[PDB]
Amino acid sequence: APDGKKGEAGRPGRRGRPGLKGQGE
Amino acid sequence: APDGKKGEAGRPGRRGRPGLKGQGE
Amino acid sequence: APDGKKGEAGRPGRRGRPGLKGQGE
Amino acid sequence: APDGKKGEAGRPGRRGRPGLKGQGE
Amino acid sequence: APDGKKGEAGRPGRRGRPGLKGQGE
Amino acid sequence: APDGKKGEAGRPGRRGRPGLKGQGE
Amino acid sequence: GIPGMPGLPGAPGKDGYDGLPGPKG
Amino acid sequence: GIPGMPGLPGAPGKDGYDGLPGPKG
Amino acid sequence: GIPGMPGLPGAPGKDGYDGLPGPKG
Amino acid sequence: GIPGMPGLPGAPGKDGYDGLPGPKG
Amino acid sequence: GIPGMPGLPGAPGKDGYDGLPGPKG
Amino acid sequence: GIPGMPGLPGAPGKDGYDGLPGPKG
Amino acid sequence: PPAIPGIPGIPGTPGPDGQPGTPG
Amino acid sequence: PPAIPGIPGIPGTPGPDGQPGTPG
Amino acid sequence: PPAIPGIPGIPGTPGPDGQPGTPG
Amino acid sequence: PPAIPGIPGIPGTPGPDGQPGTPG
Amino acid sequence: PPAIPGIPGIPGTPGPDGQPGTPG
Amino acid sequence: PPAIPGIPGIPGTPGPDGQPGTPG
């Protein structure tokens, strides 16, 4: 029986961007 | 006859964002 | 012959946003 | 009868970003 | 033989936006 | 046997944008 | 007996656009 | 014997929008 | 009797781009 | 002999969000 | 007589990126 | 004679991210 | 009798634009 | 007996808006 | 007689650019 | 014997948020 | 004779970058 | 003999990050 190929699951989202400095005092 | 299910139509886009204040006089 | 339904063509992109004022002299 | 697998419904959108401070008086 | 229609290839991305002026000296 | 065509794998994402200058001292 | 085939969901709508910001008050 | 056909996954939801920034405190 | 197969919808168009901002008045 | 049918790939994940910027140091 | 099956359209291309802004003149 | 069935294209890759901007020179 | 298939749904309409800004 | 196919899932709901800003 | 299938639609055209800014 | 088809994969999880900013 | 199916199209190329800024 | 179908392609890898900024 020539069975059907499995698909591949989506890849996880990357990290969010990291915050920068607050005020310049 | 085991007939095929209907699909569902896409949902309408939300409102656009509302403008903020102009100049600070 | 129960023929197949035609699809519908994509909708045209909206206008681009219009530019705002240049410098405040 | 080797019946067909059900699909999985999409996941809900995350929260919107929360507003930051207004004017610096 | 009622053969199957060919699809159409995607359209090329437009130009990137062109840079504006550097510093106001 | 009129066998089925292979698909083509997605194309790699382009580079990220490169950072610009830090503070103007 | 041969079954019917189901359809897929419609794509959700693109959101509205930002209203331009207020004039002189 | 003829098998059933599986469905595909639903599209994940568009995220919420940014809450407007605070008023005078 | 064997039924026909329906097509899917076309993708909606990418919007236009921002017009550049005004010159000296 | 009738062949099996293959599946398609999963959609890649939406990325994380920007961490808020630092407080007074 | 059994008909052929049609293909779907290709995805339109991602646009180019913004050219960096001008140097000192 | 029964034909084979073709596959579809892979999704193009998400681009890289912006490198952080330069330190004090 | 042998069955008949379903039809696909269409994309939703694109939202209306937001309300324009305030004064003062 | 010959089998019956499955049905596709639907898109998830769009998230609620974020909380509005602070004072002072 | 056995039926014939339908054909898919194409993507819509990308919008024209916005109008350029004002003076003064 | 006549064959059986495959199943599709699922979308990947959405990434965790970035680390919050620095001081000074 | 029984028919043969069609083939799918490919994604379009990604656009070239924009022109770099002016002087003065 | 009756034919066998094809397999679908996979999504391309996500690009590497851009180079970090300059000094002076």
Numbering used by the authors:
A (entry chain J), B (entry chain B), C (entry chain M), D (entry chain I), E (entry chain L), F (entry chain K), ...: 6 to 30
M (entry chain A), N (entry chain D), O (entry chain H), P (entry chain E), Q (entry chain G), R (entry chain F): 7 to 30
Task: Give the exact sentences the study uses for this entry.
We next attempted to introduce some asymmetry into our structure by increasing the length of peptide B by including 6 more amino acids at its C-terminus from the full length sequence of C1q30 so it could more easily be identified in the density map. This new peptide we call C1q-B ″carrot-top” peptide (B-Crt). Following this, we were able to use this narrow region model as a starting point to build a model for the full C1q collagenous bundle. The full structure of the C1q cys crt assembly revealed a hollow elongated assembly, ∼ 100 Å long and ∼30–50 Å wide depending on the region of the structure. Top-down views of the map revealed the octadecameric nature of the assembly with six copies of the triple helices. At the N-terminal base of the structure there are spokes extending out of the structure, but these were at too low a resolution to resolve the individual chains. Past the spokes the structure is quite narrow and subsequently widens toward the top as shown in Figure 2c. At the narrowest part the three peptide chains in each PPII trimer are nearly parallel to one another and untwisted. As the structure gets wider toward the C-termini, the peptides wrap around each other with a right-handed twist as expected for a canonical collagen triple helix.
One of the of most well-studied defense collagens is complement component 1q (C1q) found in mammalian serum. A key feature of C1q is its “bouquet” structure, containing six flower-like C-terminal globular domains, an intermediate “branching” collagen-like region, and an N-terminal “stem” where the collagen-like portions bundle together. We have recently recapitulated the unique C1q octadecameric structure in a series of short (∼40 amino acids) synthetic peptides derived from the native sequence of the C1q stem region. Here we use a peptide self-assembly system to design collagenous assemblies based on the C1q collagen-like region.
